């Protein structure tokens, strides 16, 4: 306001503490809003008034005044803000000391309230005064207070004052030679922020000055501050000190050499922030230049030299993974484990330095790196016997964490070492010396041991282990109690061994282990993490220690029932009860199943999902093992809750519930009077569904197989066929699902004779009956006749074979299935018919062979072996090009026959290969292609020998042989390269050859007036190129990248179809090996020039344009990738190209397109 501010400014000096306080405070809330009304007179009075109160006798008015200036600046004049600084900057020089503290603190407050526009003018006035204040004219804390604000400025607004950078530097350099050690350390922090926000020219001025003065050696008191400086720069700048270091590291080695507690300590920690921030420098020097200095204690300031050396090793191990395998494990553990005692702080960093080494040894997700560690185990154990009985809490904690990591990385490695460790655990565990923080680690470690070892190793030690563990369960503090119970949970699995039988005394501890747990379960009045761990544990105690437990069990079970109703513990008690019910020690549950099952059924609608799956899985294993407790009421409670669970939305929830019903069906055939409502109805909500998985499908077939056997009302056999087929007797994708489902019902209850019969006359009556109906009819026959012996009603064969010639090709393709699948059920009968039919008439040759595939692809291996040589003879005869598929269908049976047994057939193919025909040689190599599998298969060792024999004598043949030979190489290099990685030396010479344009194979076959040139050797080249893409994923280990990038060039100017493939080879190359690419980056960009600049003749069509325009943008898409390269990218032609693309509009309208 105008008069209210003419009011406050009078209250602001009314000689009362309370007056001045509230006046400022009210003004401080008004300046922190949008601030209504401050005329150009207020600015010259309010700011004149604030500055006064920075000298008040009351300090609280001083506080409000200082905290006022900040939220005043972002709401006032450009000229007025300058005026403030000039006051504070002169107040730095100061008269009274009170002013020197409050003005310096005020200046910090202002420096924060700067966001980029006006903030430059603010800082420029300050920076000009601080530089003159940093000047050497002797002042203890006038130099200091100025240096303090200087750092607080460059961290926030160091981006501004770019033209003031070389002003600051040339005034901070001669302050490192100050009498006060304090100044030197204060200037380092100031320089810390400078090296960051500045650019090269002034960074170099520092580094060189720093180096040349180090070379000057001059003064000892400075040389130590001058090394401290190279340190803090490595922290702040990081990669900036990357370049200037080959010049640096030698001089600092020449100094940690020199006799001095002080300086040597300051060099090792400088050496740290070189291998901690710039993994470029690679030097083993630092390792050895620590090993010597890691033990400098003669017999007090000396200690710190070790600690700094330990830190470095830890930060050298934390980065390098290639230095671990051989190197570290022999040179460091021999010294780390050695120096495992000393003074607590160095010990702690030494310990830590082995943890980092153990961190590094982790699984990747002669001798392996861990076998060396396996050898090192006994020395560590020996060392840790001494350490684990230590007074210090922190030392012993590093011991347990050491083991905890060790046991996780190399499990079982603490087997022959247990008895010399346990006393150490038991000590720290129960004696008063510890903290909560420590025994909780001692427990965790004990747990981690118990899990990853044979329960046998602990047997003779359960004596000293149980007493304190059980005592820990009863600890006051909640975080210990849970971890103690989580140990107790495994202790029971150590007396149990119900995986493998083992005679061990159990009874002496079931008294103590039981009571301590229920005292924590019957509490209901402590932390909920304990409440749950008590249940998770007591589960395992009941599961295992049942036959030795008193009449406490049935009453405690009731406690599990009451913890089940709880909104918090339920899930924990659900799976705690899942494990009890399924224990081989068949323990009672009859007294809590009565009401338990409904309370369990209830959970199903709580949509917790996690609880849904947990309760289902318990319902399964509760209905199984106690199928005599179940009432008709219990069941009807569960069934009327399941309908929402069966739905395509969630396959796994559904398929767990279905397979629960499968369990129900088999164990209480009475109960299923009920599923005729919603349950069944929604079970077809999964069949018709176009996402029914092969897993969840077979989880449902078993359900039907177990449902029509029970003979429940409504759900008969001939009843359920119409619940599946009804839908498809009216008018997407899986009709199959409805067939192999209807099949399972037939083989269940054999009123099959007629059920199969109505299905045949449904294909004969193709009049009126649609493909939607004739299709499902066939596929179902195949699925029924797969297990049943269908050689009955000839309204079969000659009716299936009628659908071989249906208007709908959908029908033909599933008619082929039907024949093939039907034959499996009686192989001796159909197989010499189908073999016979193939030669018989070519009029059905193709579709018949495709039935033969399904006969190979499904027959008993016991019952197909008799006919193996016959099939082979028939397939050999048929490499006729009557069609081309005719061959590729045979060249897939042959293939799948080779899978069936390879010993006799794999070299048999190599036999026909030796000197075949133009089409028989095509058949043998493609057969061996369909032998190549994704995951390793029991055929592949015998393959890894023969693929040499194939490929080597397959690159030399001709025509459409090389095309296949190169595809078979591709597939091998792509699917399982361990067939090819050790054959690439002999093969690559043959490959690169097929990358050059065959001049003989270009032929002129012009149509009419316009002339046309075709390239026969295009697809052998287009296939050879797709190998060089394939070999770039797994096989770059065995490659001459330079000789490779020769051929990348050919196809950079080759056919449009190929240019594409190599443009994507570049983008991968410029990442997977940026080193070799840049060396040849000259003759990689000009072929990309040609592909870009050449404009299409404006008279041509819609496609002709875009087909070349999508081409243009795969060249740029490829230029972009060559740009992100280890920076030396500005080579002759490339720097030219960067101005060329920023000149052209259209050629910029392509770089714009993608990124």
């Amino acid at each position: 306001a105008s008069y209210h501010i003419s009011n406050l400014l009078e209250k602001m000096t009314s000689s009362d503490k309370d007056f001045r306080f509230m006046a400022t405070n009210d003004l401080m809330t008004e300046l922190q809003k949008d601030s209504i009304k401050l005329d150009d007179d207020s600015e010259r009075k309010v700011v004149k008034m604030i500055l006064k109160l920075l000298e008040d006798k009351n300090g609280e008015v001083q506080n409000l005044a200082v905290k006022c200036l900040g939220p005043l600046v972002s709401k006032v004049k450009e000229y007025q803000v300058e005026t403030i600084v000039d006051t504070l900057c002169t107040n730095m020089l100061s008269d009274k000391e009170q002013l020197r503290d409050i003005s310096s603190i005020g200046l910090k407050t202002v420096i924060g309230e700067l966001p980029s526009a006006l903030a430059a003018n603010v800082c420029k006035k300050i920076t000009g005064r601080l530089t003159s204040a940093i000047a050497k004219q002797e002042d203890v804390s006038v130099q200091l207070e100025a240096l303090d604000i200087m750092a607080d400025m460059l961290s926030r607004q160091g981006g501004l004052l770019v033209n003031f950078h070389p002003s600051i530097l040339t005034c901070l350099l001669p302050q490192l030679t100050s009498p006060r050690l304090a100044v030197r350390k204060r200037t380092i922090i100031a320089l810390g922020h400078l090296v960051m926000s500045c650019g090269n020219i002034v960074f170099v001025d520092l580094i060189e000055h720093l180096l040349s003065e180090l070379s000057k050696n001059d003064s000892m008191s400075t040389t130590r501050t001058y090394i401290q400086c190279i340190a803090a720069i490595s922290r702040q700048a990081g990669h900036r000190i990357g370049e200037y270091l080959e010049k640096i590291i030698p001089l600092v080695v020449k100094f940690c050499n020199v006799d001095d507690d002080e300086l040597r300590e300051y060099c090792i920690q400088a050496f740290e922030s070189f291998v901690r921030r710039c993994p470029k420098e690679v030097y083993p020097h630092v390792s050895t230049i620590i090993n010597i200095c890691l033990k400098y204690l003669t017999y007090d300031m000396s200690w710190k030299v070790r600690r700094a050396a330990a830190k470095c090793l830890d930060a050298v191990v934390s980065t390098r993974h290639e230095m671990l395998p051989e190197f570290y494990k022999t040179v460091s553990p021999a010294l780390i484990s050695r120096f495992k005692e000393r003074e607590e702080n160095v010990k702690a960093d030494v310990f830590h330095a082995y943890l980092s080494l153990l961190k590094q040894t982790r699984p990747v997700q002669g001798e392996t790196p861990l076998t060396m560690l396996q050898s090192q185990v006994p020395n560590i154990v020996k060392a840790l016997h001494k350490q684990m009985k230590e007074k210090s809490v922190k030392t012993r904690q590093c011991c347990f964490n050491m083991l905890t990591e060790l046991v996780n990385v190399l499990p079982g490695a603490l087997t022959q070492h247990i008895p010399v460790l346990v006393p150490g655990i038991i000590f720290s565990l129960n004696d008063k010396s510890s903290s909560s923080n420590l025994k909780i680690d001692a427990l965790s470690c004990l747990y981690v041991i118990l899990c990853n070892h044979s329960p046998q190793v602990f047997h003779p030690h359960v004596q000293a282990l149980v007493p304190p563990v059980v005592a820990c369960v009863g600890d006051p503090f909640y975080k210990i109690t849970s971890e103690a119970l989580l140990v107790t949970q495994q202790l029971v699995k150590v007396i149990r061994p119900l995986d493998q039988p083992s005679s061990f005394d159990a009874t002496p501890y079931i008294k103590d282990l039981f009571t301590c747990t229920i005292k924590r379960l019957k509490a209901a009045d402590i932390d909920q993490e304990v409440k749950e761990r008590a249940i998770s544990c007591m589960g395992q105690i009941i599961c295992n220690l049942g036959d030795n437990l008193g009449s406490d069990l049935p009453n405690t079970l009731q406690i599990f029932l009451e913890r089940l109703k709880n909104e918090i513990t339920r899930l924990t008690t659900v799976k705690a009860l899942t494990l009890i019910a399924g224990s081989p020690l068949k323990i009672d549950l009859r007294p809590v199943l009565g009401e338990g099952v409904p309370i369990l059924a209830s959970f199903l609608r709580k949509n917790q999902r996690a609880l849904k799956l947990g309760t289902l899985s318990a319902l399964d294993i509760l209905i199984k093992n106690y199928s005599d407790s179940l009432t008709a009421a219990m069941i009807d409670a569960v069934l009327d809750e399941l309908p929402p669970l069966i739905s395509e939305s969630d396959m796994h929830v559904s398929q767990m519930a279905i397979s629960f019903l499968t369990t129900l069906a088999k164990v209480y055939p009475s109960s299923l009077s009920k599923i005729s409502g919603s349950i069944l109805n929604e079970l077809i909500g999964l069949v018709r569904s176009p996402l029914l998985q092969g897993g969840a499908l077979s989880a449902m077939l078993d359900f039907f197989q177990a449902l029509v056997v029970t003979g429940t009302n409504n759900l008969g056999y001939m009843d359920l066929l119409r619940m599946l087929t009804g839908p498809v007797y009216s008018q997407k994708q899986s009709y199959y699902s409805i067939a192999k489902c209807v099949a399972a019902l037939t083989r269940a209850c054999p009123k099959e004779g007629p059920a199969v019969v109505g299905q045949f006359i449904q294909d004969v009556k193709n009049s009126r009956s649609t493909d939607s109906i004739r299709l499902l009819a066939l596929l179902s026959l195949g699925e029924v006749g797969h297990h049943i012996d269908l050689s009955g009603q000839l309204e079969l064969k000659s009716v299936i074979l009628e659908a071989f010639s249906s208007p709908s090709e959908e029908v033909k393709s599933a008619a082929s299935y039907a024949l093939g699948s039907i034959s499996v059920g009686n192989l001796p009968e159909y197989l010499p018919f189908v073999l016979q039919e193939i030669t018989s008439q070519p009029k059905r040759q193709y579709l018949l062979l495709h039935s033969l595939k399904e006969i190979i692809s499904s027959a008993s291996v016991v019952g197909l072996k008799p006919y193996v040589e016959n099939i082979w003879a028939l397939l050999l005869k048929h490499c006729e090009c009557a069609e081309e598929g005719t061959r590729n269908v045979v060249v897939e049976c042959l293939g799948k026959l080779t899978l069936i047994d390879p010993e006799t057939l794999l070299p048999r193919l190599k036999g026909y290969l030796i000197s075949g025909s133009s089409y028989a040689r095509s058949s043998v190599v493609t057969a061996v292609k369909f032998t190549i599998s994704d995951h390793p298969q029991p055929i592949d060792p015998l393959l890894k020998n023969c693929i040499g024999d194939f490929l080597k004598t397959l690159e030399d043949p001709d025509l459409n042989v090389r095309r296949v030979a190169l595809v078979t190489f591709n597939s091998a290099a792509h699917n399982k390269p361990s067939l090819i990685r050790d054959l690439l030396d002999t093969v690559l010479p043959h490959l690169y050859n097929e990358t050059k344009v065959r001049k003989e194979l270009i032929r002129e076959v012009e149509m009419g007036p316009f002339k046309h040139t075709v390239d026969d050797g295009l697809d052998i080249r287009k296939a050879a190129f797709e190998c060089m893409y394939t070999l770039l994923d797994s096989c770059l280990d065995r490659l001459d990248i330079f000789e490779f990038l020769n051929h990348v060039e050919d196809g950079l100017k080759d056919h449009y179809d190929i240019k594409m493939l190599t443009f994507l080879m570049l983008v991968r190359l410029s990442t997977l090996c940026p080193s070799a690419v840049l060396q040849r980056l000259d003759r990689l960009v000009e072929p990309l020039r040609a592909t870009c600049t050449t404009k299409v003749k404006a008279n041509s069509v819609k496609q002709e344009f875009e087909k070349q325009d999508e081409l243009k943008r795969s060249a740029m898409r490829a230029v972009a990738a060559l740009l992100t390269i280890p920076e030396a990218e500005k080579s002759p032609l490339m720097s030219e190209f960067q101005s060329q693309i920023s000149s052209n509009p259209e050629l910029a309208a392509i770089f714009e397109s993608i990124q």
């Binding site: 000689s15 009362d16 503490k17 309370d18 006798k57 009351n58």
Partner: protein
């Protein structure tokens, strides 16, 4: 023939305003024996005089200096 000799000595003494047998300069009862608007703790100021808080709070109403010095009154301690 002495085993112990006094080499250095660092004594410590606290200066305080001595007034009529420590008596509060307002209610003049004592300084640790209640006051007027009570018939309760010592209240030290910036100037360093001993007062009952009740009686010293009274003197912020009419004036703002201290009943012995003349410096504007503040607060430095609540307890003897």
């Amino acid at each position: 023939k002495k085993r112990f000799e006094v080499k250095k000595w660092n004594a410590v003494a606290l200066w305080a305003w001595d007034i009529v047998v420590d008596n509060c300069a307002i209610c003049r009862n004592h300084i640790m024996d209640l006051c007027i608007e009570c018939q309760c703790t010592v209240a030290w100021g910036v100037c360093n005089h001993a007062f009952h808080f009740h009686c010293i709070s009274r003197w912020l109403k009419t004036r703002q200096v201290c009943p012995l010095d003349n410096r504007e009154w503040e607060f430095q301690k609540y307890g003897h």
